[PDB]
Amino acid sequence: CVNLTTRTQLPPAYTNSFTRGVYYPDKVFRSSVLHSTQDLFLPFFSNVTWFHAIHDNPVLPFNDGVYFASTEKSNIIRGWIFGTTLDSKTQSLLIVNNATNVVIKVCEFQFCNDPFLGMESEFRVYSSANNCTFEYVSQPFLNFKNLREFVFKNIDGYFKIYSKHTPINLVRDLPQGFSALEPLVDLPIGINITRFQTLLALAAAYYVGYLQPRTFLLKYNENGTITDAVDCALDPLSETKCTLKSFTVE
Amino acid sequence: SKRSFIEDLLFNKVTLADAGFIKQYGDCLGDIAARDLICAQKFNGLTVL
Amino acid sequence: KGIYQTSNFRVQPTESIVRFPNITNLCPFGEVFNATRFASVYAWNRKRISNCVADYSVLYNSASFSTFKCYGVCPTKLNDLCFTNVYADSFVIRGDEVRQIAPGQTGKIADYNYKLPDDFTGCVIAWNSNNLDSKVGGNYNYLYRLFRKSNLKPFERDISTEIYQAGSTPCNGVEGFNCYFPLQSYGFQPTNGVGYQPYRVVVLSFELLHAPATVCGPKKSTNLVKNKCVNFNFNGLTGTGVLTESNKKFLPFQQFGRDIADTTDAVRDPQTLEILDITPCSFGGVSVITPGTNTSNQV
Amino acid sequence: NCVADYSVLYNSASFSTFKCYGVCPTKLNDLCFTNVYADSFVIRGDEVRQ
Amino acid sequence: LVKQLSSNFGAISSVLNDILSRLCPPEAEVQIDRLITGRLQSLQTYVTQQ
Amino acid sequence: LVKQLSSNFGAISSVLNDILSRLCPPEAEVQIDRLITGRLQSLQTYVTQQ
Ligand SMILES: C=CC1=C(C)/C(=C/c2[nH]c(/C=C3N=C(/C=C4\NC(=O)C(C)=C4C=C)C(C)=C\3CCC(=O)O)c(CCC(=O)O)c2C)NC1=O
Ligand SMILES: *[C@@H]1O[C@H](CO)[C@@H](O[C@@H]2O[C@H](CO)[C@@H](O)[C@H](O)[C@H]2NC(C)=O)[C@H](O)[C@H]1NC(C)=O
Ligand SMILES: *[C@@H]1O[C@H](CO)[C@@H](O)[C@H](O)[C@H]1NC(C)=O
Ligand SMILES: *[C@@H]1O[C@H](CO)[C@@H](O)[C@H](O)[C@H]1NC(C)=O
Ligand SMILES: *[C@@H]1O[C@H](CO)[C@@H](O)[C@H](O)[C@H]1NC(C)=O
Ligand SMILES: *[C@@H]1O[C@H](CO)[C@@H](O)[C@H](O)[C@H]1NC(C)=O
Ligand SMILES: *[C@@H]1O[C@H](CO)[C@@H](O)[C@H](O)[C@H]1NC(C)=O
Numbered sequence A: 001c002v003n004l005t006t007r008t009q010l011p012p013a014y015t016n017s018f019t020r021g022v023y024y025p026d027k028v029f030r031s032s033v034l035h036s037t038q039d040l041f042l043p044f045f046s047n048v049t050w051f052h053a054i055h056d057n058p059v060l061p062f063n064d065g066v067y068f069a070s071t072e073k074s075n076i077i078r079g080w081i082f083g084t085t086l087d088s089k090t091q092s093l094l095i096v097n098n099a100t101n102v103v104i105k106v107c108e109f110q111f112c113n114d115p116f117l118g119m120e121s122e123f124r125v126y127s128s129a130n131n132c133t134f135e136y137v138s139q140p141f142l143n144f145k146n147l148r149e150f151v152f153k154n155i156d157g158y159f160k161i162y163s164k165h166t167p168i169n170l171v172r173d174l175p176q177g178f179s180a181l182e183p184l185v186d187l188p189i190g191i192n193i194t195r196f197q198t199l200l201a202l203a204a205a206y207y208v209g210y211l212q213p214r215t216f217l218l219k220y221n222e223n224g225t226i227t228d229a230v231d232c233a234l235d236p237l238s239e240t241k242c243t244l245k246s247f248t249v250e
Numbered sequence B: 001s002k003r004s005f006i007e008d009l010l011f012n013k014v015t016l017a018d019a020g021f022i023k024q025y026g027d028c029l030g031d032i033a034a035r036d037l038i039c040a041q042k043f044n045g046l047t048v049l
Numbered sequence C: 001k002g003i004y005q006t007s008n009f010r011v012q013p014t015e016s017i018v019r020f021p022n023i024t025n026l027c028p029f030g031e032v033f034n035a036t037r038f039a040s041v042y043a044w045n046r047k048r049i050s051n052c053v054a055d056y057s058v059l060y061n062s063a064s065f066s067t068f069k070c071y072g073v074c075p076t077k078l079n080d081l082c083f084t085n086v087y088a089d090s091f092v093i094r095g096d097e098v099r100q101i102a103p104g105q106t107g108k109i110a111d112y113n114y115k116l117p118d119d120f121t122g123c124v125i126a127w128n129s130n131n132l133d134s135k136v137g138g139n140y141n142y143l144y145r146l147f148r149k150s151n152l153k154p155f156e157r158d159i160s161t162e163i164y165q166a167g168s169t170p171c172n173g174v175e176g177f178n179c180y181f182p183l184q185s186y187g188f189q190p191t192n193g194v195g196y197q198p199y200r201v202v203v204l205s206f207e208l209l210h211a212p213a214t215v216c217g218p219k220k221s222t223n224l225v226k227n228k229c230v231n232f233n234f235n236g237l238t239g240t241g242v243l244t245e246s247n248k249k250f251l252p253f254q255q256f257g258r259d260i261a262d263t264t265d266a267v268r269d270p271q272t273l274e275i276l277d278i279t280p281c282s283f284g285g286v287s288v289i290t291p292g293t294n295t296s297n298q299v
Numbered sequence D: 001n002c003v004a005d006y007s008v009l010y011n012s013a014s015f016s017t018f019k020c021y022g023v024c025p026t027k028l029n030d031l032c033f034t035n036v037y038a039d040s041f042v043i044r045g046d047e048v049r050q
Numbered sequence E, F: 001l002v003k004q005l006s007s008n009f010g011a012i013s014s015v016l017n018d019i020l021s022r023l024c025p026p027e028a029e030v031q032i033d034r035l036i037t038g039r040l041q042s043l044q045t046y047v048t049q050q
């Protein structure tokens, strides 16, 4: 494939990840309760790497599940790649959306150095496909305004993908609001994932954070939706709320 | 009642979180939107005489 | 003489009610048990199964399993259950190595080619195929990994073929001394020893009563009786209680609702998508006021 | 005076039965033993159960 | 006390009916005994505090 | 109370790490449950006496 030469980039930006990175631990309906659960979560108020498209994307390690998020207005950010070597020697998870059908593959891929789709044509993101073991395709379809926050994790052979899509009116940085991520897909792949990369279709930016094994308190309201949460071991106040099993401390 | 003024203040200051001393079957079966704590106790053999 | 808060024996349920999804499709048991080709162990096949009724009586009529070991679900209770997801991990192995297909075991198969979670729930089914897969002169279409740099994870499929550096000699990924080809083959002959005969194995992995059920056992559904304490069964979740109408905004992926006590509070009927609260039959204490015996028996 | 790999037996051998009491085998790699005695013999096939 | 009905006490599940619909007596009774002793322990603790 | 940490409570050992290094979940959890219930019993007894 082609190689990029002209780059208008900067050193990787950093921001604060807070009030985000929480997902439903299971598929049970419970309402007006406080439930404690221990799992890999995004620690609140941690440091999250902020990337921009030049005005390309590096490959990042996949440590025990990754939180991804990005704000969008023209569907630039069109997929991800996961694997260890990413050169067709091993199976590599591929997720793509070429404006028609979301495609999921585990084929052995010779990935292009510089993914790009479409401006309005030229699907050029890989150059090999052999010994494949999975394929999924959906049905046809056609400031930043839509925030999409995903969690990608790999636990005992299942690649679990949680997601949340919301409307927004904000361009500068991540919002200060709270939103829980529903479970969307669980794929049995059986793949050893260690490194990953994103996909652009060539204003654009995204944020990547890393999960840690933490205990969290989750608040289900009268409609069974997560409205708030407390990190455990974030700080003495949160630890007090965590041991007391309450969001209010006297 | 024959409660005094001061007694009325006392009863109105301390809160008795038991839904009173009456909670009928139909009261719980109609209270399906809140999942009352007392109903949950009552359905598990826990009663307040 | 006095009052006694007596135990609650007065009411006992009389009948049963069975409710299941309304699926008439027969499950593709044949395509996995009756298959021309099984996957090799290093590249074991994983088949999603869905929209199924599971009778396992065709296998009774024709097949004969050497081993049927179920973890987490003893088989006799298998008829009256429904499953959230079902994955059939199908492959072939050597006869002795059938022992290795189990949680907590180790071996070449357990370590390099296939692995189960220690918390696995589901059934391992194995039967010999020495008269079908094997052939005179050997069968080299069934391979397995013999060396790996480290141990496997559960349900991890490593189809890599690159050279393994057994020694400290870096042989550039090409064959050489102290570094060999990880994949090896069995020589299956119909006259070979029992421990060397090929065995077809299928592992049905699922997880119970935590999500909507689309596959289920063969029990037929019944009509529903409300405002009466009955022995109910919804998607394999059994119980006894009074079923009454309710309003609950269940999410599409949510199948069961639970109260403070984490007991099932309400169920979404699989056939008619309405939510029913369950309440215990013997609600309400009963206290007996009586004069002491030796005086009267009225109460 | 031993290091126990039990990978040579993997490369060549094929055991009919491997039953460990008190030590489940997967935790066997990361353990060291005070004493080790190999009681070796031959028996009839059924009596392997005994 | 009611929250202690959510405890598994080492069992596969906190729900009796799930165990009984999934498991059969010879090893189901063990999980049922575990739940029974856990819940009876919780009751004994509650009564002692009272 | 501290001496009660030496009790096996019917387990193979009183040390958690020994069990975990020797045994793996499907039957290790049983011994761990035994130790946990024994030690929690000792704590409950101590708190009651206090
Ligand atoms: C690449 C994987 C990918 C996933 C996992 C995905 C999930 C997903 N996206 C959806 C909506 C949608 N998803 C998109 C676009 C995207 N959403 C994305 O995650 C990405 C990367 C894009 C493209 C850049 C749009 C435009 C909608 C409809 C929003 C609307 O109603 O306007 C829906 C709901 C389907 C519906 O109700 O119509 C799902 C399940 N879409 C995808 O393309
Ligand atoms: C998944 O892939 C990673 C990356 O190759 C493996 O970890 C490496 O393994 C090699 C070989 O033993 C070591 O030399 C490296 O030091 C390891 N790196 C890290 C970061 O661990 C890992 O072993 C693979 N998973 C499995 C189950 O084999
Ligand atoms: C250039 O492209 C080739 C493939 O055509 C690739 O092997 C090489 O790594 C690329 N180099 C750069 C600097 O992008
Ligand atoms: C990440 O942010 C934290 C504060 O949130 C800061 O202390 C740390 O230095 C940042 N990381 C880097 C590499 O600067
Ligand atoms: C790209 O979109 C076309 C048109 O819908 C579709 O046929 C194709 O499958 C998509 N790409 C891939 C890799 O599937
Ligand atoms: C919960 O749902 C009800 C019914 O749709 C609605 O009236 C209420 O506003 C919802 N709760 C919140 C917090 O919006
Ligand atoms: C299944 O659903 C249909 C429509 O909801 C209903 O009419 C029918 O009685 C149900 N049961 C069967 C066995 O079809």
Ligand SMILES: *[C@@H]1O[C@H](CO)[C@@H](O)[C@H](O)[C@H]1NC(C)=O
Binding pocket: C029, C030, C034, C058, C059, C062
């Ligand atoms: C499998 O094949 C045998 C013989 O080929 C046949 O008798 C049996 O019915 C088949 N199984 C099923 C489920 O049809």
Ligand SMILES: *[C@@H]1O[C@H](CO)[C@@H](O)[C@H](O)[C@H]1NC(C)=O
Binding pocket: A130, A131, C159, C160, C161
């Ligand atoms: C991969 O495919 C090639 C042919 O394209 C084949 O020779 C090789 O055996 C395959 N490897 C695996 C692991 O299936």
Ligand SMILES: *[C@@H]1O[C@H](CO)[C@@H](O)[C@H](O)[C@H]1NC(C)=O
Binding pocket: C294, C295
């Ligand atoms: C019980 O009955 C006996 C004989 O009928 C009588 O002597 C005794 O007084 C009675 N006791 C009471 C408490 O009535």
